[PDB]
Design a protein around this ligand. Structure first.
Ligand SMILES: *[C@@H]1O[C@H](CO[C@@H]2O[C@@H](C)[C@@H](O)[C@@H](O)[C@@H]2O)[C@@H](O[C@@H]2O[C@H](CO)[C@@H](O[C@]3(O)O[C@H](CO[C@H]4O[C@H](CO)[C@@H](O)[C@H](O)[C@@H]4O)[C@@H](O)[C@H](O[C@H]4O[C@H](CO)[C@@H](O)[C@H](O)[C@@H]4O)[C@@H]3O)[C@H](O)[C@H]2NC(C)=O)[C@H](O)[C@H]1NC(C)=O
Ligand SMILES: *[C@@H]1O[C@H](CO)[C@@H](O[C@@H]2O[C@H](CO)[C@@H](O)[C@H](O)[C@H]2NC(C)=O)[C@H](O)[C@H]1NC(C)=O
Ligand SMILES: *[C@@H]1O[C@H](CO)[C@@H](O[C@@H]2O[C@H](CO)[C@@H](O)[C@H](O)[C@H]2NC(C)=O)[C@H](O)[C@H]1NC(C)=O
Ligand SMILES: *[C@@H]1O[C@H](CO)[C@@H](O)[C@H](O)[C@H]1NC(C)=O
Ligand SMILES: *[C@@H]1O[C@H](CO)[C@@H](O)[C@H](O)[C@H]1NC(C)=O
Length: 555
């Protein structure tokens, strides 16, 4: 029923809702993340990446609905959601709301008899291109054939039987587990990804829909299977990967957890060494191990301790092939849970030399066990916004002028980062391949991100209406329980001096967008308003007439 209009990528655009024959738009104060998540699910577009206010995909025409959608979040249709007519707002079409959903992938098969076979093409940065044969597996093929409604995947032939194509190769590495129902639901990396030999391109043959798509396997009674395909209730089924890493801050690090007898469980760190970790990292397509961690380094598990005294020599393609003590009944506690850090683990930081700054510094990436600088070549404002969103700031920032210093000191990891529309992390952005080399500050990137809190419409930047950035868009704070202790937190976070006032009742003017917080009840010693007790993320009965303000002293 709902439609997205005016987007550049699929599953994006301005939100439009029909009643009767009349389409209308929704004001950016009326449409929550929960309502956005119901729309993305209903439209088969995955999950919500961004809620965007301010007529980002252009202003609409005609009707604007006066209704708020009070979705719980798990409704199947937007029509099932409770609707509250709010008082008749000052919303024009310059505040029509918009949504980026997660299934923005543009992928197809070209030059076979049907769309059920051919060379894989991916559209990135307005341009169709191939994928590398070495970057594409059978798990990826099963997901794509289900997406194209073409049954199951038969083959991934390497010798280009449908033509190499007259075009570019994207170096993207999909890491589908095999149980996903759209390529947009799979984890994917493009950052630093290696080139492949010319014309070594990926191809898929699907079965067609004369076979139905396999369901995921649901059983953990037996020893886990090392094949993609298992047998369950007289039907073939895709093995859901019964190994995960948790609490590592990424796909290729964290505590090793294993699914058996209906429960996720941990591994004891006795005899847990690098060879064991290598097998884990191989099985997850995470490269090689750089660390086998013990001593509950990423935290302690909730569930049984299934495996102990695992002694892989490193041959094995799965941890289930390794010699252990078998399932359950071991003489150790969760203070010794095992984990890994693998060579494909990626992390991101800004480093200030003398500190004081929170959203500013030299951009650095962690890869293959090492930190290194990100080069500044080709780097657009939109790429800096993705960086700044990923580091926990607002989605905008500025690159400092290049240093005159042409003499090499630090290691660089990657350069030529060029983010497309849609990802909110740097890892799905194409670049040059990883190359550890020495580099001068001439080549390095210093970033000043916009903070996720600001004061608008006063005589300094330390005085005005409180606005907070969350989930895509700037929004406001309601003034119920908003006191001087809240203002002392806002002033401290901005790096202003003493709080003078906690203003109420839209004293510097009403804002736009959603109202992200109400019932903010700070102790008063917090370093950020995100540490404060509040009714978080858009559940409020307020309007923009009740917007909160802070006035602080400079310096
Ligand atoms: C297996 O795949 C094929 C191919 O499907 C298409 O390609 C894949 C890659 C996907 O993208 C998929 O979404 C595509 O559709 C499926 O064949 C298609 O099947 C659909 C559904 O049955 C057909 O639509 C119609 O059935 O067409 C009927 C009219 O058929 C005449 O006209 C067609 C051209 O328009 C001719 O191809 C056909 O030979 C006839 O001469 C029409 O009666 C149907 O409409 C009625 O029912 C719908 C609800 O389903 C209702 O909304 C309407 O009001 C109406 O009452 C319907 O339009 C496709 O024409 C057909 N495409 C091709 C290329 O053959 C196949 O269904 C699928 N099998 C399974 C098990 O899923
Ligand atoms: C993961 O492995 C690396 C490599 O051994 C560890 O880095 C070293 O840490 C020790 C002690 O902290 C230092 O003496 C070495 O100089 C470091 N070497 C290198 C090459 O970086 C790292 O500490 C390990 N991390 C975890 C969590 O186990
Ligand atoms: C602000 O003050 C509160 C006091 O209520 C500090 O809260 C403590 O948090 C830890 C969490 O590990 C508790 O174990 C302590 O018992 C709490 N109270 C005290 C008195 O320490 C809070 O950490 C303070 N924050 C800042 C940034 O100063
Ligand atoms: C496993 O469970 C899922 C979700 O309940 C279901 O859709 C699927 O058909 C099941 N598959 C098998 C082989 O039992
Ligand atoms: C406000 O403006 C001054 C002018 O240079 C700037 O230095 C300062 O960092 C700004 N403060 C905030 C909280 O934006």
């Amino acid at each position: 029923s709902p439609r997205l209009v005016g987007g550049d990528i699929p599953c994006s655009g301005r939100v439009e809702v029909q009643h009767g024959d009349t389409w209308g738009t929704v004001c950016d104060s009326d449409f929550s993340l929960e309502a956005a998540s119901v729309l993305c699910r209903e439209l088969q577009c995955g999950t919500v990446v961004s809620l965007l206010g301010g007529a980002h995909f252009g202003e609409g025409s005609g009707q604007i609905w006066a209704e708020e959608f009070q979705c719980e979040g798990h409704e199947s249709h937007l029509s099932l959601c409770p609707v509250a007519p709010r008082p008749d707002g000052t919303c024009s079409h310059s505040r029509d709301v918009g949504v980026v959903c997660s299934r923005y992938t543009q992928i197809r098969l070209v030059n076979g008899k049907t769309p059920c076979e051919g060379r894989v093409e991916l559209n990135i940065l307005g341009s169709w291109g191939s994928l590398c044969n070495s970057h594409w597996d059978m798990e990826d093929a099963h997901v794509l054939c289900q997406q194209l409604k073409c049954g199951v995947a038969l083959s991934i032939p390497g010798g280009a039987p449908f033509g190499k194509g007259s075009e570019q190769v994207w170096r993207h590495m999909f890491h589908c587990t095999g149980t996903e129902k759209h390529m947009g639901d799979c984890s994917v990396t493009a950052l630093g990804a290696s080139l492949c030999s010319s014309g070594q391109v990926a191809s898929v043959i699907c079965s067609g829909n004369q076979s139905q798509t396999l369901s995921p396997c649901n059983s953990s009674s037996s020893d886990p299977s090392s094949s993609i395909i298992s047998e369950e209730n007289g039907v073939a089924c895709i093995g859901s990967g019964q190994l995960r890493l948790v609490d590592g801050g990424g796909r290729c690090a964290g505590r090793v957890e294993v699914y058996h007898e209906g429960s996720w469980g941990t591994i004891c760190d006795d005899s847990w060494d690098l060879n064991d970790a290598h097998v884990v990292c191989k099985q997850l397509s995470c490269g090689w191990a750089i660390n086998a961690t013990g001593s509950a380094h990423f935290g302690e598990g909730t569930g049984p301790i299934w495996l102990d005294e695992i002694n892989c020599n490193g041959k094995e393609s799965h941890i289930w092939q390794c010699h252990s003590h078998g399932w359950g009944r071991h003489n150790c506690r969760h203070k010794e849970d095992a984990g890994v850090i693998c060579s494909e683990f990626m992390s991101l930081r800004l480093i200030s030399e003398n500190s004081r700054e929170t959203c500013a510094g030299r951009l650095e990436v962690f890869y293959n066990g090492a930190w290194g600088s990100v080069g500044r070549n080709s780097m657009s404002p939109a790429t800096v916004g993705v960086v700044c969103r990923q580091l926990g700031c607002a989605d905008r920032g500025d690159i400092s002028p290049a240093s005159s210093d042409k003499t090499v000191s630090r290691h660089m990891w990657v350069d030529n980062v060029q983010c497309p529309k849609g990802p909110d992390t740097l890892w799905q952005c194409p670049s040059s391949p990883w190359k550890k080399r020495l580099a001068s500050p001439s080549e390095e990137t210093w970033i000043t991100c916009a903070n996720k809190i600001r004061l608008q419409e006063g005589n300094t930047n330390c005085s005005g209406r409180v606005e907070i950035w969350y989930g895509g868009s700037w929004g406001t704070v309601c003034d119920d329980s908003w006191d001087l202790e809240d203002a002392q937190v806002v002033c401290r976070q901005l790096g202003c001096g003493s709080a003078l006032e906690a203003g109420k009742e839209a004293a510097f003017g009403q804002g736009t967008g959603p109202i992200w917080l109400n019932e903010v009840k700070c102790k008063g010693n917090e370093t950020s308003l995100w540490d404060c007790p509040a009714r978080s993320w858009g559940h409020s009965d307020c309007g923009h007439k009740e917007d909160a303000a802070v006035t602080c002293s400079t310096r």
